[PDB]
Design a protein around this ligand. Structure first.
Ligand SMILES: [Ca+2]
Ligand SMILES: [Cl-]
Ligand code: NA
Length: 189
């Protein structure tokens, strides 16, 4: 399936050195201005060595910049695009109190947020309600990604941008939620 199909996404890694990966079904999409063929559909099995679909992803913004991919009760940890030793692991082994089958995740430089249903968990290296703490985000999300000053929440074929300081949905034209394909990916539409 092509990047600009208009279909919902499953997961996004966090922005690292200006690039990230998008996941949908069995496919991995590399989004980087410096890439020769940005957004070519590659198999997750080829790039990451695991079967899609994946539930959630995040990337730490420390020196090592490890990427974490979640599916079911399992997670995989990558550095330099290679699976670390002793992965995959049960989520319970690395992430005390975080549930299985998460909807989304994002990392901030150090906290990770995990999203599932109407709730989210904070993990540092009880659940709270998404809507109470992420003002204007209506509840359940499919995917999430953190940048520098904003996080992005993906719901179906649309998304929200949330300011990290205010934890509020930004006021843009046309307003959030809006098309991922048209306004986030810059897809010809
Ligand atoms: Ca997901
Ligand atoms: Cl995600
Ligand atoms: Na993510």
């Amino acid at each position: 399936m092509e990047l600009c199909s208009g279909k919902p996404f499953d997961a996004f890694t966090d922005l690292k050195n200006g690039s990230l990966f998008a996941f949908r079904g069995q496919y991995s999409y590399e989004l980087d201005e410096k890439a020769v063929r940005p957004g070519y559909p590659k198999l997750i099995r080829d790039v990451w060595g695991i079967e899609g679909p994946i539930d959630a992803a995040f990337t730490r913004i420390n020196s090592q910049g490890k990427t974490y991919l979640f599916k079911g009760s399992q997670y995989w940890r990558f550095e330099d695009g290679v699976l670390d030793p002793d992965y995959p692991r049960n989520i319970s082994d690395g992430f005390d109190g975080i549930p299985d089958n998460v909807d989304a995740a994002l990392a901030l430089p150090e906290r990770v947020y995990f999203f599932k249903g109407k709730q989210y968990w904070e993990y540092q290296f009880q659940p709270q309600f998404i809507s109470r703490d992420w003002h204007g985000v209506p509840g359940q999300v499919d995917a999430a990604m953190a940048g520098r000053i904003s996080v992005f929440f993906f719901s179906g074929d649309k998304y929200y941008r949330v300011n990290l300081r205010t934890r509020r949905v930004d006021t843009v034209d046309p307003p959030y939620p809006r098309s991922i394909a048209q306004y986030w990916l810059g897809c010809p539409a």
